[PDB]
Design a protein around this ligand. Structure first.
Ligand SMILES: *[C@H](O)[C@H](C[C@@H]1CCNC1=O)NC(=O)[C@H](CC(C)C)NC(=O)OCc1ccccc1
Ligand SMILES: *[C@H](O)[C@H](C[C@@H]1CCNC1=O)NC(=O)[C@H](CC(C)C)NC(=O)OCc1ccccc1
Lengths: 301, 305
């Protein structure tokens, strides 16, 4: 039984991580079929990081300026182009370990696993979530750029994040695998900051349902609420507003437990009002918001 | 920047997981060289699990009673043996994905990654600590038995755990890969209780060091304590004793942050007697104790495998 933050097994992604070097800059690349994807700022210099002109910098490159190492093997680059903030390096060998995969852009509240890598080698795997302010709370050091976030439902890897930068509060920003940033950020070192972050309300509700499924009922009550009254209260605690779409998505969990979604919304209002009074819920003394409805069902069933 | 509960990359282990079926029972096996390891209770049936005679059950089994499936391939079992609570199945072909590895037995308070599996198929990875009462706080459903726990060192996988059962409180119990149980548990279908658990003091201190390294500094204070002074208060709060080896282990972190271990113990002493007074540490309202000192050093310096 039990309930834990769980990442996807990382092996499918480990077989795709390579090292990419251009000049003095090394980061990680993602080798799928005969294309290596990585953040375009690997072509920057140290004088050209406030206002890089990427199209100008790329034109001055040849294939042989890019050193791509897969394990102890140099891959030969035969082409290069830029798609948004992602560089695509064509190589002369399709990766034999390429899994079934697709590229997907996720919405705020969505979770995914991150394979943190340095110098093309994996360091560790963890779980996290796209925050409402389009950042993620990762664990990343110098040289982590090009690490990716992913889901594996079925035997297919969905790549949804590539790492590009750290913001002044210590949270992180990056792109989908088509190189479009999440949020308003840009890949230069001009002043940028995360907007105020909020709690992912539908995820907290999912996690309360997970608590009921595992046998906890101490936080329930006999009250219900309207959707509108719930959001008026919730937003006073910096919670994201709950939409009718979120209510629908909670239907299965609602049905499994016999607790209406608006009844569970009433429990949450009380928890925000009272705190936990020294109790814990699923091993936590805070309300957890990085489990989706879909994660809860997958881990409980 | 940032700090997360982090597992080892699981790829080397994923290549070893297979499905093992005996009669009506199906669970996971670990395929290394030409031997599959899995829990011995795979040979039980309904009536048997109440009080099994595993030797008697095993002698009645032939090789062909064991269906081992590795992805889409059936593996031919040519031998079967038992070591403690682990069944070993010799197969006719070595696993070409066998990594460098060894079997190790860990100590309570040490951490490892679990690869939860169902029908030989990896489905999730998470980081666990062996608790002082020899349970682990895992997440496992029917069919999870045979999932394994491990650490990585350079390129060597150190297998330390194989999953066998769940206890009434929802925590879990298993064996090392030589089939010796962790904790005072037996592999039969009976409710068994774990002892009262305690907090892993040296890991709490490691995590406070990770907090400081990430700029979370409000719990620091001007005071220090002594081992004997601190331990007297640790006992009171169901905290493991802090030994002299624990202090030395924390040396690197202590010298990296400028906070001597006994300075940090004074901070932890206060957190125990006074609580956190509405504040959090690394996003937690509780004192986290499932990061060892090595875990904090590895994550904060970017060690790779
Ligand atoms: C690529 O590996 C790197 C990742 C940052 C570095 C430290 N931790 C991370 O997650 N990206 C950059 O250094 C990035 C490049 C720009 C062209 C976007 N700049 C960046 O993140 O600057 C802020 C910063 C850099 C170094 C230390 C602290 C903050
Ligand atoms: C092996 O896959 C299984 C793991 C349990 C199943 C539920 N969650 C787990 O971690 N082990 C057992 O079921 C175990 C087998 C004995 C022969 C040692 N027995 C056990 O403790 O089962 C408790 C249970 C009760 C009701 C439903 C499911 C399990």
């Amino acid at each position: 039984s039990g309930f834990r933050k769980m990442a996807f097994p990382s092996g499918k992604v480990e077989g795709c991580m390579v090292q990419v070097t251009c000049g003095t800059t090394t980061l990680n690349g993602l080798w799928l079929d005969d294309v290596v994807y990585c953040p375009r700022h690997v072509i920057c210099t140290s004088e050209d990081m406030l206002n890089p002109n990427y199209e100008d910098l790329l034109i001055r490159k040849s294939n042989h300026n890019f050193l791509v190492q897969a394990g102890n093997v140099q891959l030969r680059v035969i082409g290069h182009s830029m798609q948004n903030c992602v560089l695509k390096l064509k190589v002369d060998t399709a990766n034999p370990k390429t899994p079934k995969y697709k590229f997907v852009r996720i919405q705020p509240g969505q979770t995914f696993s991150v394979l943190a890598c340095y110098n093309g080698s994996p360091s560790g795997v963890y779980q996290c979530a796209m925050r409402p302010n389009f950042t993620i709370k990762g664990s990343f050091l110098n040289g982590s750029c090009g690490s990716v976030g992913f889901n594996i439902d079925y035997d297919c890897v969905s790549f949804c994040y590539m790492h590009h930068m750290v913001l002044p509060t210590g949270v992180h920003a990056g792109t989908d695998l088509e190189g479009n940033f999440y949020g308003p950020f840009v890949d230069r070192q001009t002043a940028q900051a995360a907007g105020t972050d909020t709690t992912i309300t539908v995820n907290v509700l999912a996690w309360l349902y997970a608590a009921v499924i595992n046998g906890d009922r101490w936080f329930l009550n006999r009250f219900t609420t309207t959707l509108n009254d719930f959001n008026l209260v919730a937003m006073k605690y910096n919670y994201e507003p709950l939409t009718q779409d979120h209510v629908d998505i909670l239907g299965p969990l609602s049905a499994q437990t016999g607790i209406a979604v608006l009844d569970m919304c009433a429990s949450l209002k009380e928890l925000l009002q009272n705190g936990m009074n020294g109790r814990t819920i699923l091993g936590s003394a805070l309300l957890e918001d990085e489990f989706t409805p879909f994660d809860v069902v997958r881990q409980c069933s």
